Design a protein around this ligand. Structure first.
Ligand SMILES: [Mg+2]
Ligand SMILES: [Zn+2]
Ligand SMILES: [Zn+2]
Lengths: 395, 1239, 99
DNA sequence: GACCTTCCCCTGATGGGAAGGTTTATAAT
DNA sequence: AAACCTTCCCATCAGGGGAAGGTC
């Protein structure tokens, strides 16, 4: 075989199933890791995660000063790494370890004096934490180390947990296969819900993990279908409404004999009737432009589609002729009227202007302009000046 | 622009095109239908849906264009920009490009000289791979599985990196140092022999150095960023009514986006491996299905078992882009309709319906109406032509006047499938076609349809008058014979006129002139067939080109005198004194053209038609049931043969004869009886009419209607008559090919059920063969045009005496085609001398028109060395001289005329008249014609009998007649019986050849396809490599051994042959190179290598001409020669010359080697390489041209890694971009334009 | 049936084959070869540039025709730009040089 | 002349609602 | 499929004001 679905179906066989002791003891390992974390918090998961991240932030703050002082005293001053670790281990609070390293009197010992100025203030940042967190710079590190160990325990146990029950995900996903969504998409969206179930399962309730994992995976597959199946995405609740309508119209088949009257579904369903026709008009799916056409020939639906945005040249020629005709006509009037018409309208100009807009730079404001236009249009209303343009209006 | 280039796409260059990143696989809203943010149709990434309008609607006009509204991030511009704006998707994990992996020459495969299978294994996340090992137990590249890698990390935590998946392949391509690796393979090719060391090395080095030349980087094989196609290229446009219509590209992109997003989510979500590896494989699958679907798994569209069409499928194939769109398009200003006869037309005009004329010439009519003040503006003229006002009709007459239109028959086999005519407005909806042109189109009035095209530009109107005009094309380009010739009723009327019968009214009387003959017939006094003799004045221009009229009285008929009035002035009236059927109405037309010229001949043919139609009309020329006269002897003949078979029946029932013996016996006797019956009815028909001469009986050629139709050539031939009035032979099955129970009945008596059922057997194979052949002939002619296009006449003269020796095809007893026909129209390679040596009949090189042909024909000459296209000193084209002359016009071929396309057409048009299968049926020599025995290349000796015997295998038997020409050619095997010898005088058939019996394709159209493809025969004959006595081998080990024995110097050559193959060569005899040690069918490669270019270019033409000679097809050898030239355009160097086993174009090897040989430097020796038409077409400088014709994916991939460049330098690539093709008028324009360029 | 100027296909600008009398006649590779056999460069170019593709050329030629001027300003066939976009939609980079 | 009540336009104030997200425990591979 | 809950966006309603109308 070649397809990757086979590379997955036969790969998951290497991980053995777990029941029933396996469930409980791997869950106990998970809880033991998280319980290692719980004691480390001493010195709903939503706030718990912020607490964890705050400890991590404190350790990052300390490590920043660590690496800064290290780059300053090793890269910028050439002191050996051992001479830094030996003198820095134990205090990590005061400046007592810097003056001693100066008194060492090795060649690098002089460059410490210059970085002493730059390290003193970095140390004040590091020391202040003690007055905030009520701990020494070493206890922070130790607590973080132990809690990271707890995380590692939880991680190994949870990966094993999901790997063991992977098969149930396929067992659930094979039921839904044909909904415009490929198979591996279904099994993966189900694995996501399987993980979400693992992280939110109490092994102490005594129930079998199968049920909870089943619920979560079923939800994670159905909702995922609603999300990613149709090319035009539809609100999640609308897919539920469509499925309900289809279920009712399916059940009423043997009742009405052939099919139900549309007004009935509004009765059987909770919704008034005027929305049902919209819900049915919405469900139309796109047709591939490669769909074969009549005579079962090579012609396809992507061929018979014209372009209607384009304007036929028969009309563009008329547009140009009207351009020229109005150009010759406006020149027949006066210069004042010509400018007024080419201003109120966008003729031969950047943009159209309003009444006060035109009156602004014409030295006589609104009403004057209103009197010119109505006059010029009157002067052009007359035949023997409107024939060539009158040929353009046909209704 | 002036060129096109193709290269790899770097990730940064990919982002360069993109104007935004696609994040969500959404298209439109589902209630507003607007383009969602970051969706495939996003107006922020690509552009607004509406022209000069913003999505939010805040910015609405041309007032402000360049601005990005802070509301929705849209810039108000032209909506058409959604056609040009690309996008990009940021792939979470690297993904390999399918083309660079699945293509036959896997790029990544032999780029790291890794195998394809192992790369595929690594990509599926089924194993690891090492990269940059340095000082490690393992190499820099290797494979290991899960357990192996498990305990491998503890060995060396650092300095040892082994990845898995696409990231691993990419990193292997990145840290790879191409120069370092390359700098080794060179030496690996030099020292070590054993071509296995030279199989892929000599190609891998090429790949490396070309990769470095292009400048692109190998890491780009793995796509970091995925480019997207503009939305208007894959529209979701609403299909009305209601339902939407999308592109499968959209579904593929949606899948890709979904999977990349899920991968990102899982990455942030911190999921274990198995899940993410499955997701990586899903993403790779989606990408590969989006690029080239079907190579792996053929993902399917929802709601269908139909696969969704991917990107690569929108380019390759007859359907798709290249063939279906760029090389051919639906065209405006065109129409279609049913054609019908109007004979009243001239040869240059055709009847065009007024309804079609109004629609086609609409813009011209609008403009003309607006010009003359008849319409205020364009809309008014539109409404006028819409209203069918009378005034417009005159206007139509004004605009159609002298405006040629192109008429096209649905199938276009050759260029004559399209010809221009002068429109003649007619009522009705039927198109009127000129009869004389029907032969060119191959179109009947049985319902065939034709299309029309209106030339727009002035240049096109001139090209439709000087080039494609109906009158400017009369004689075919494939052969000099005119394609415009009276077909059925014309020749029938003329044959009725020129016919003569004794005792006709007024026979023997005399008339003042032809006018009186007409006045005598039309008055009812004299008939039209009388043997009257009248006075006629014939014109002959002589002795200085000065016309001199000649007056005299001749032996003629009234009808021939009437027909003489149409003949132009310059003809001799000996052309009009005979039966005057079709076969020489043709020759009359040809002589009129090649004497008086084009202008007289056009009106001559028009008058021939005008008169023949009316005369055949007033002649009656009907057909009745009594016109088919069966022979009264037929009964007795049939009964005799029928009884004859009973003896054979008794013979087999006993065992005296076998089943096959008796079957052949019966079939032979029945065939002979059929001969007898047909002969009886023919003798009762041809001399049927007998009447009284001056009062006493005499028998003459008959006036029988059907027989007149047979004799004139207007319609059905003698084979039709034999079945019309006699037993219609015996039928043939699909195979078995002949049945013992013949058809006793003739069509007139009527068939009985059994015989009709037997006939349907042969009827089916006939009908079926035509239908499926239609499909394959197109393929053949298409390959032919593909291998020939860019070849154009580019030079005046090449200056080479090489040419080819033209000798008549004297096969067996007589000649199949004289030398005049194989030499006429071409140019001599060297001065032909009179048969008396050292003289001059023709100068060094000159075009041999009909006059030199006649001069040669008078003098005893069957030897003329003719310059040919195959051997020509021209580069990238052919010069007018060596090609020779040909056209509708009979002068030397012009310059810039694209001859390759017309040659492909000349070979493809007759391809539809061929057949799919042959199924042939059918010993001292007897010389026929009186002459002199002339032996050729024979060693002989005298023996006991005293006469002469042949000691050589090859021995030709020529005949030097009393004139000196050679009309006999016979081959005699080893040990013959020679009665005269070389240079003797034979009687009227003295037998000089005697020996013993023993001592001991399809073919057709498929055959033609095989010859042009240089396909190896089934059981090839092998050829000797050098002169010398042959030598045998060790023993039969597998096949056998054969040792070459050169005589003088280097004599190490050898070969191995199977003992199952019989041998023919002599053992202790000298045998030159290119000799048949083994009987069999020869291969083009072997002939070329062991005989030379001219020998093989003659073999190809002589063999491919036999299948066309079998069927009544005649084409000048010139087109086949140009095709053969295009085949052998490649060659391989031997000595590497001054600069770099390689294969290159012959012209380039010359431009590089001969110019340096002039420079006094070392010469480079090449070896002609013979390729088929499709294979020779596979190799072309232009990559666009190659990617258009075939194998788009592979060609484009290879040209991409090569970074190759295309300046288009040619025909197909020019039509692809819509430019003037470099030929004809395009040649005249390109010459001036290119002269000023690059200089 | 006959047609001077009708509608055009969306993705590739070519006159539609329908519907159905107003479809533009098909000019296949064989007809292009027929135009190539004769030396007819302007006929072929206007056949595959002004009459089918070249969204600008159609309008230009129509206006010129209605003005009594019979001259073509040929542009780039739209199908070729579509092909360039499609090829560029891969890891392939195809461009055009100076002018 | 003021006073009491009346008749129409901007800030936003919001109940309304569509689109979106998280749970669901028998066991269920 | 249901079940109760949060973010965002409507297109409309209580509230204010700037004056406006009508009269013992
Ligand atoms: Mg027909
Ligand atoms: Zn906006
Ligand atoms: Zn030449």
């Amino acid at each position: 075989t070649t397809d990757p679905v086979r590379m997955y179906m036969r790969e998951m066989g290497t991980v053995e199933l777990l029941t029933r002791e396996g469930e409980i003891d791997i869950a106990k390992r998970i809880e033991d890791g998280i319980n290692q974390v719980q004691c480390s918090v001493a010195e709903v998961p939503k706030q718990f995660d912020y607490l964890v991240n705050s400890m991590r932030v404190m350790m990052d703050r300390v490590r920043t000063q660590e690496r800064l002082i290290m780059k300053l005293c090793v890269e910028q001053c050439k002191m050996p790494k051992k001479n830094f670790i030996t003198l820095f281990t134990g205090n990590e609070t005061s400046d007592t370890w810097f003056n001693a390293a100066i008194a060492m009197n090795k060649p690098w010992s002089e460059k410490l004096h210059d970085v002493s100025e730059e390290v003193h203030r970095a140390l004040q940042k590091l020391q202040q934490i003690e007055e905030e967190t009520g701990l020494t710079i070493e206890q922070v590190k130790d607590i973080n180390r132990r809690m990271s160990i707890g995380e590692a325990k939880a991680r190994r146990a949870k990966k094993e947990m999901v790997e063991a029950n992977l098969r149930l995900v396929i067992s659930i996903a094979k039921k839904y296969t044909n909904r415009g969504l490929q198979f591996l998409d279904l099994i993966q969206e189900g694995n996501i819900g399987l993980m979400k179930a693992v992280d939110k399962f109490e092994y102490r309730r005594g129930y079998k993990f199968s049920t909870y994992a089943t619920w979560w995976i079923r939800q994670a597959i159905t909702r995922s279908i609603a999300d990613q199946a149709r090319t035009i995405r539809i609100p999640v609740h609308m897919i539920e409404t469509i499925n309900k309508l289809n279920r009712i119209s399916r059940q009423m088949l043997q009742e009405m004999g052939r099919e139900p009257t549309p007004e009935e579904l509004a009765e059987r369903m909770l919704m008034p009737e005027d929305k049902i026709r919209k819900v049915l008009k919405i469900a139309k799916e796109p047709i591939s432009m490669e769909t074969p056409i009549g005579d079962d020939e090579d012609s396809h639906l992507g061929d018979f589609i014209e372009d209607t945005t384009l304007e036929l040249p028969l009309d563009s020629a008329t547009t140009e002729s009207l351009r020229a005709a109005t150009h010759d006509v406006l020149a027949g009037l006066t210069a004042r009227e010509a400018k007024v018409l080419r201003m109120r309208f966008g003729i031969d100009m950047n943009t159209d202007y309003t009444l006060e807009e035109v009156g602004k730079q014409f030295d006589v404001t609104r009403e004057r302009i209103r009197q010119i236009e109505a006059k010029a249009l009157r002067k052009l209303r007359h035949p023997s000046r409107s024939e060539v343009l009158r040929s353009f209006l046909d209704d | 622009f002036d060129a096109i280039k193709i290269a790899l796409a770097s990730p940064d260059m990919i982002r360069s095109w993109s104007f935004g990143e696609v994040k969500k696989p959404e298209t439109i809203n589902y209630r507003t239908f607007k383009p969602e943010r970051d969706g495939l149709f996003c107006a922020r990434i690509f552009g607004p849906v509406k022209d000069y309008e913003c999505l939010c609607g805040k910015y609405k006009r041309l007032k402000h264009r360049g601005v990005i509204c802070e509301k929705c991030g849209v810039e108000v511009t032209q909506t058409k920009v959604r056609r040009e704006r690309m996008g990009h998707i940021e792939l979470a994990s690297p993904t390999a490009h399918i083309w660079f992996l699945k293509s036959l020459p896997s790029r990544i495969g032999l780029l790291l000289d890794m195998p394809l299978r192992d790369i595929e294994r690594v990509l599926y996340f089924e194993s690891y791979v090492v990269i940059e090992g340095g000082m490690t137990n393992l190499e820099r590249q290797q494979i290991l599985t899960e357990e192996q890698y498990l305990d491998a990390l503890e060995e060396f935590g650092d300095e040892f990196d082994a990845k898995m998946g696409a990231e691993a392949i990419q990193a292997l391509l990145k840290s790879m140092d191409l120069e370092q690796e390359c700098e080794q393979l060179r030496e690996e090719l030099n020292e070590t022999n054993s071509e296995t060391k030279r199989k892929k090395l000599t190609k891998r080095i090429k790949l490396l150095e070309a990769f470095v030349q292009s400048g692109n980087k190998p890491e780009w094989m793995i796509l970091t960023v995925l480019p997207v196609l503009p939305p208007d290229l894959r529209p979701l446009v609403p299909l009305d009514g209601g339902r939407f219509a999308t592109s499968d590209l959209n579904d593929l992109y949606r899948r890709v986006i979904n999977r990349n997003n899920r991968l990102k989510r899982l990455l942030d979500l911190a999921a274990p491996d198995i899940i993410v590896r499955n997701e990586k494989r899903m993403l790779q699958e989606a990408v590969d299905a989006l690029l080239d679907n079907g190579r792996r798994g053929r993902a399917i569209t929802g709601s269908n078992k139909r696969p969704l069409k991917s990107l690569a499928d929108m380019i390759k194939g007859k359907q798709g882009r290249f063939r279906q769109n760029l090389l051919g398009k639906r065209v405006d200003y065109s129409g279609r309709s049913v054609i019908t006869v109007g004979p009243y037309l001239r040869l240059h005009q055709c009847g065009l319906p007024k309804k079609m004329a109004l629609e086609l010439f609409k813009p011209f009519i609008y403009g003309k109406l607006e010009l003359r003040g008849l319409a205020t503006t364009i809309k008014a003229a539109k409404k006028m032509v819409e209203r069918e006002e009378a005034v417009v009709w005159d206007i139509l007459d004004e605009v159609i006047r002298e405006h040629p239109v192109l008429l096209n028959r649905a199938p276009t086999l050759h260029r004559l499938g399209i010809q221009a005519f002068e429109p003649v407005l007619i009522e009705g909806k039927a198109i009127q076609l000129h009869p004389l042109v029907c032969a060119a189109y191959n179109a009947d009035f049985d319902g065939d349809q034709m299309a029309v095209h209106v030339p727009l530009t002035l240049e096109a109107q001139l090209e439709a008058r000087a080039l494609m005009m109906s009158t400017n094309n009369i004689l075919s380009p494939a052969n000099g014979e005119p394609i415009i010739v009276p077909s059925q009723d014309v020749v029938l009327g003329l044959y009725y006129m020129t016919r003569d019968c004794v005792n006709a009214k007024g026979e023997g009387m005399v008339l003042t002139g032809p006018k009186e003959a007409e006045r005598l017939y039309r008055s009812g006094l004299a008939s039209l067939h009388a043997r009257v003799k009248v006075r006629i004045t014939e014109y002959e221009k002589d002795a200085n080109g000065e016309l001199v009229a000649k007056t005299s009285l001749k032996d003629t008929t009234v009808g021939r005198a009437i027909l003489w009035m149409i003949v132009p002035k310059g003809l001799p009236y000996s052309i009009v004194n005979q039966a005057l059927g079709k076969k020489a109405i043709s020759k009359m037309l040809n002589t009129c053209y090649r004497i008086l010229g084009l202008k007289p001949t056009v009106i001559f043919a028009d008058q021939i038609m005008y008169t023949g139609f009316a005369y055949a009309a007033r002649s009656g020329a009907s057909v009745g049931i009594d016109d088919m006269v069966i022979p009264e002897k037929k009964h007795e003949i049939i009964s005799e043969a029928e009884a004859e078979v009973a003896e054979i029946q008794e013979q087999f029932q006993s065992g005296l004869v076998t089943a096959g013996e008796r079957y052949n016996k019966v079939i032979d006797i029945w065939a002979a009886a059929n001969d007898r019956v047909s002969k009886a009815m023919m003798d009762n028909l041809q001399t049927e009419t007998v009447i009284n001469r001056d009062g006493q009986e005499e028998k003459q050629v008959s006036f029988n209607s059907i027989y007149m139709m047979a004799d004139s050539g207007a319609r059905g031939s003698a084979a039709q008559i034999r079945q019309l009035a006699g037993m219609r032979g015996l039928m043939a099955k699909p195979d078995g090919s002949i049945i013992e129970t013949p058809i006793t009945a003739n069509f007139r008596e009527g068939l009985n059920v059994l015989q009709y059922f037997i006939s349907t057997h042969g009827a089916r194979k006939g009908l079926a063969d035509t239908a499926l052949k239609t499909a394959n002939s197109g393929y053949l002619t298409r390959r032919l045009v593909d291998v020939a296009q860019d070849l154009v006449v580019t030079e005046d003269d090449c200056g080479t005496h090489e040419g080819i020796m033209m000798t008549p095809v004297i096969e067996g007893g007589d000649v199949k085609e004289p030398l005049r026909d194989r030499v006429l129209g071409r140019v001599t390679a060297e001065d032909v001398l009179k048969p008396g040596t050292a003289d001059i009949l023709v100068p060094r090189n000159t075009l041999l028109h009909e006059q030199w042909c006649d001069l040669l024909e008078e003098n005893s000459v069957d030897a003329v060395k003719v310059r040919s296209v195959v051997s020509c000193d021209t580069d990238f084209g052919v010069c007018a001289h060596c090609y020779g002359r040909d056209l509708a016009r009979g002068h030397i071929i012009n310059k810039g005329e694209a001859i390759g396309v017309i040659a492909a057409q000349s070979i493809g048009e007759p391809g539809t008249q061929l057949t799919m299968r042959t199924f042939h049926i059918g010993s001292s020599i007897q010389v026929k014609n009186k002459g002199s025995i002339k032996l050729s290349n024979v060693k002989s000796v005298v023996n006991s009998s005293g006469k002469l015997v042949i000691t050589s295998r090859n021995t030709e038997l020529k005949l030097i007649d009393e004139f000196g020409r050679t009309k006999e050619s016979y081959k005699v095997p080893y040990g013959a019986v020679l009665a005269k010898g070389d240079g003797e005088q034979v009687a009227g058939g003295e037998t000089v050849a005697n020996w013993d019996p023993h001592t001991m394709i399809t073919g057709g159209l498929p055959r033609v396809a095989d010859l042009f493809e240089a396909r190896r025969p089934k059981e090839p004959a092998i050829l000797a490599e050098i002169s010398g006595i042959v030598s045998f081998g060790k023993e039969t080990k597998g096949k056998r051994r054969l040792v070459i024995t050169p005589v003088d110097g280097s004599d190490p050559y050898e070969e191995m042959i199977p003992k199952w193959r019989q041998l023919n060569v002599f053992e202790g005899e000298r045998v030159e190179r290119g000799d048949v040690i083994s009987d069999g069918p020869e291969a083009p490669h072997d002939i070329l290598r062991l005989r030379g270019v001219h020998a093989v270019t003659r073999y190809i033409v002589n063999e491919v001409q036999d299948v066309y000679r079998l069927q009544g097809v005649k084409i000048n050898d010139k087109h086949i020669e140009v095709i053969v030239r295009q085949m052998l355009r490649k060659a391989t160097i031997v000595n590497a010359g001054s600069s770099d086993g390689e294969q290159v174009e012959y012209s380039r090897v010359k431009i590089a080697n001969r110019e340096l040989e002039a420079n006094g430097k070392v010469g480079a020796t090449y070896s002609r390489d013979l390729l088929g038409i499709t294979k020779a077409s596979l190799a072309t400088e232009s990559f666009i041209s190659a990617a258009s014709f075939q194998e788009t994916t592979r060609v484009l991939t290879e040209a991409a890694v090569a970074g190759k460049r295309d300046e288009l330098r040619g025909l197909k690539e020019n039509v692809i971009v819509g430019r003037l093709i470099p030929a004809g008028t395009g040649y005249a324009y390109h010459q001036d334009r290119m002269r000023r360029r690059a200089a | 049936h006959a047609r001077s100027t009708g509608s055009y296909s969306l993705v590739t600008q070519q006159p539609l084959g329908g519907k159905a009398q107003f479809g533009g006649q098909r000019f296949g590779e064989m007809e292009v070869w027929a135009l190539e056999a004769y030396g007819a460069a302007y006929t072929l170019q206007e056949m595959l540039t002004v009459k089918s593709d070249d969204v600008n050329g159609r309008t230009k030629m129509y206006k010129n025709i209605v003005d009594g001027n019979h001259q073509m300003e040929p542009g780039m066939p739209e199908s070729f730009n579509v092909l360039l976009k499609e090829i560029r939609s891969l890891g392939i980079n195809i461009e055009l040089e100076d002018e």
